[PDB]
Amino acid sequence: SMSYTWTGALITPCAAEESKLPINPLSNSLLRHHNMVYATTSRSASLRQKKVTFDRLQVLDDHYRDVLKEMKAKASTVKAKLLSIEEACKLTPPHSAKSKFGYGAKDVRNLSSRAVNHIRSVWEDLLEDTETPIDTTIMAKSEVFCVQRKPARLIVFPDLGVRVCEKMALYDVVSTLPQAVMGSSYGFQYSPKQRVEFLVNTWKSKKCPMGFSYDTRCFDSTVTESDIRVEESIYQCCDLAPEARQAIRSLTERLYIGGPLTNSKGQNCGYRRCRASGVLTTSCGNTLTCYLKATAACRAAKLQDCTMLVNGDDLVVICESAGTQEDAAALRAFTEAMTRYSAPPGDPPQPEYDLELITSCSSNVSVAHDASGKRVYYLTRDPTTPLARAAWETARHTPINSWLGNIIMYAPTLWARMILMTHFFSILLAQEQLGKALDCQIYGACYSIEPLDLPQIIERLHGLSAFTLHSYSPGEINRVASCLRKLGVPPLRTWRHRARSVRAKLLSQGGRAAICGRYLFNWAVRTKLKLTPIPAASQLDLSGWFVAGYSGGDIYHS
Ligand SMILES: O=C(O)c1c(-c2ccccc2F)c2cc(Cl)ccc2n1Cc1ccccc1
Numbered sequence: 001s002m003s004y005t006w007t008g009a010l011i012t013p014c015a016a017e018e019s020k021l022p023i024n025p026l027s028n029s030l031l032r033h034h035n036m037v038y039a040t041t042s043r044s045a046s047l048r049q050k051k052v053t054f055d056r057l058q059v060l061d062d063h064y065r066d067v068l069k070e071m072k073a074k075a076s077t078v079k080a081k082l083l084s085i086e087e088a089c090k091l092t093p094p095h096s097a098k099s100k101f102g103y104g105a106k107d108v109r110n111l112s113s114r115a116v117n118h119i120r121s122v123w124e125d126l127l128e129d130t131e132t133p134i135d136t137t138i139m140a141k142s143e144v145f146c147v148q149r150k151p152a153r154l155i156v157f158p159d160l161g162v163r164v165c166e167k168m169a170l171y172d173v174v175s176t177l178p179q180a181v182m183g184s185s186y187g188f189q190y191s192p193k194q195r196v197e198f199l200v201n202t203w204k205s206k207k208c209p210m211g212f213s214y215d216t217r218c219f220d221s222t223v224t225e226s227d228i229r230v231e232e233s234i235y236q237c238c239d240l241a242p243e244a245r246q247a248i249r250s251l252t253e254r255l256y257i258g259g260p261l262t263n264s265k266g267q268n269c270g271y272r273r274c275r276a277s278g279v280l281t282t283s284c285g286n287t288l289t290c291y292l293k294a295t296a297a298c299r300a301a302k303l304q305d306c307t308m309l310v311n312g313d314d315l316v317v318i319c320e321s322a323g324t325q326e327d328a329a330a331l332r333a334f335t336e337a338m339t340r341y342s343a344p345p346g347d348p349p350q351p352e353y354d355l356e357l358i359t360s361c362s363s364n365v366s367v368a369h370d371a372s373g374k375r376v377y378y379l380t381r382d383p384t385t386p387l388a389r390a391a392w393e394t395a396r397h398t399p400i401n402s403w404l405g406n407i408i409m410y411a412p413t414l415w416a417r418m419i420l421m422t423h424f425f426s427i428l429l430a431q432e433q434l435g436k437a438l439d440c441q442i443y444g445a446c447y448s449i450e451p452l453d454l455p456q457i458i459e460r461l462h463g464l465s466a467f468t469l470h471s472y473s474p475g476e477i478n479r480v481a482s483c484l485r486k487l488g489v490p491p492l493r494t495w496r497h498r499a500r501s502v503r504a505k506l507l508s509q510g511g512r513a514a515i516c517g518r519y520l521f522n523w524a525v526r527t528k529l530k531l532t533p534i535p536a537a538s539q540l541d542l543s544g545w546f547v548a549g550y551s552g553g554d555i556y557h558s
Pocket of ligand 1: 410
């Protein structure tokens, strides 16, 4: 069946669409080549539609069924709970898209009559109606990139009331199930530090390691009605409340397998027969599905001792090498099996024999040394996208601050410390907004974070070594340097100068600002101050942080 079918109507915006980076004084300080930074618009929707629209031919086999049974036996041990309206309401972002039924995210959050009554009425319709397709809105996403142009991403999502009903029935499932089914292979149970720990141990545990990253072209579109039903069958293995069991059953047929696409004008856009990106089960469902297809493809291909790390469609395999000629063949056999399971490659996979050469979750493993000269492993990535997005956030007030998430997640990196910390700490201080909370996403979930809380947050996630790292690899230094030239970002010596300036100002303020100068900017000065465990880091409530993925699940923690 076709992934999509269209009516001819256009994917429309609900407002004016900015695509060009503004010539702004503050963003210009970070990036000069403004014409190389763009945001995607609905003007590219058609190129994405051509790329995502195709017919799927799936052929499941003995290896696929064996693994599915192994996965169900593990799912059998889970006892999932049904969240109340109030608990489900509390997990709604304050700026989540309002309902088409005269209420919004703030009404949901405050548990207002119009909101609570409508959610209850949607819940009963899921218990009573097991057939009628649920309506979704199709929108082109607005994301920022650097040139060399990408076409817009298509986002599919149901109404507010429905989204609160998915939380009541599925939130605890998507939170505890993947870890019970997959174990150490579920990448969302880890922080960045724990992620390096697992990749290094897995690599070092093999006698002769071989690794590869497998890229699926338009994974959401490769997902069939069969894959979605097989997914519900893993969910049914949970101990469930009668109403939750019915809601999962109804949501699977009416929403998860396919449904009507409606544009912002209210016109009919077409029909979806694959994965909606704006649902609660997108993260969990894609992880399980990618893990099932890959695990069975390893057996079919005769690849030895497979250890895998899955985060939705992002998959990395670390196995036992059988030699060059053997490895090449087995990797093609793996691809052959994935194509049959309806997961063909975007860019063909390559056998790697050095961990640092593999890219998984846009990241790669790299080495730097601590204050005591000992080797420290950390996750990095190419800084182009994070820098182009930080420039946009400087000129325009965005709902989610990617720059803040990049600081937290990539805190030990050369680029987050020197550029991202310096740029924002200068601007915020000059505006008296260092203690003003900001929204960011960690693993799809929304968090309200004060920039001044960063030293404690980094010490917990990355240890004190995040504030002492030096002697970065030549490769890492070359990548940072060539990117700065490309985007027209000032050299590292200008950043070192700018850092010295903020550090002083932060130190004279005292309180939490002095903690920021001492820890975050100790790299910028030769007379290094004494760095000890911050009292506040000991009692940080970092639960809920690295548990599960919630991309498109409309989730708000804190
Ligand atoms: O965007 C994520 O969800 C995310 C981040 C991340 C990066 C910056 C800010 C906030 C974040 F959450 C991340 C960072 C590292 Cl070092 C490793 C994996 C990571 N993921 C999972 C992931 C799964 C699939 C594809 C990409 C990333």
